[PDB]
Design a protein around this nucleic acid. Structure first.
Ligand SMILES: [Zn+2]
Ligand SMILES: [Zn+2]
Ligand SMILES: [Zn+2]
Ligand SMILES: [Zn+2]
Lengths: 84, 85
DNA sequence: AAAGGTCAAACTGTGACCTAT
DNA sequence: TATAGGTCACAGTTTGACCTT
């Protein structure tokens, strides 16, 4: 189970138990430094089924749970896979 | 000649001579009340070729050039096409 | 002259599965 | 084994040129 939307989560990703959807979403967001805007009141419901209706709230729950921006690899460590 | 992207513009749209690209962009943005974020410093060049590279800057030139949000039809007048008496 | 409608084409994002260590 | 990035069909979104008005 993932800490952001409650889907199946095999292991931790960037510091938090997360599924492979929010894993990639958080990764892509950090990779592109993308910014989102909530069209509601910053409380859109983030479960397995409505996670993708507001990327701001999905990313605002990624940070609330405890996802780490820095664990996503940049600078020297870009395109470097596996452990270190 | 469109005031927002310098493309061909046959007539005015929501107050300003604009192309049908920036027309549809302006209409859709206001209709959906969508909001954008410039990934840069709100300085992206909006030409015919780069207009689609930053939607936030493209909408801030729509407003700077003087297109008016209110001309887009909502409430009573939505789905209403053509001119008005 | 200018409003909304249309929608094929282009464009973009998601995520199950993979490999890398 | 845990967890990093890679892949990329598949899905979802955006665009304007054109059309009806
Ligand atoms: Zn998740
Ligand atoms: Zn939201
Ligand atoms: Zn234009
Ligand atoms: Zn910009």
């Amino acid at each position: 189970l993932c800490a952001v939307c409650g889907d199946n989560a095999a292991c931790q990703h960037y510091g938090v138990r997360t599924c492979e959807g929010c894993k990639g979403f958080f990764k892509r967001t950090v990779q592109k430094n993308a910014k989102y805007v909530c069209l509601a009141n910053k409380n859109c419901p983030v479960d397995k089924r409505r996670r993708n209706r507001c990327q701001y709230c999905r990313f605002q729950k990624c940070l609330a749970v405890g996802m780490v921006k820095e664990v996503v690899r940049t600078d020297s460590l870009k395109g470097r896979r596996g452990r270190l």
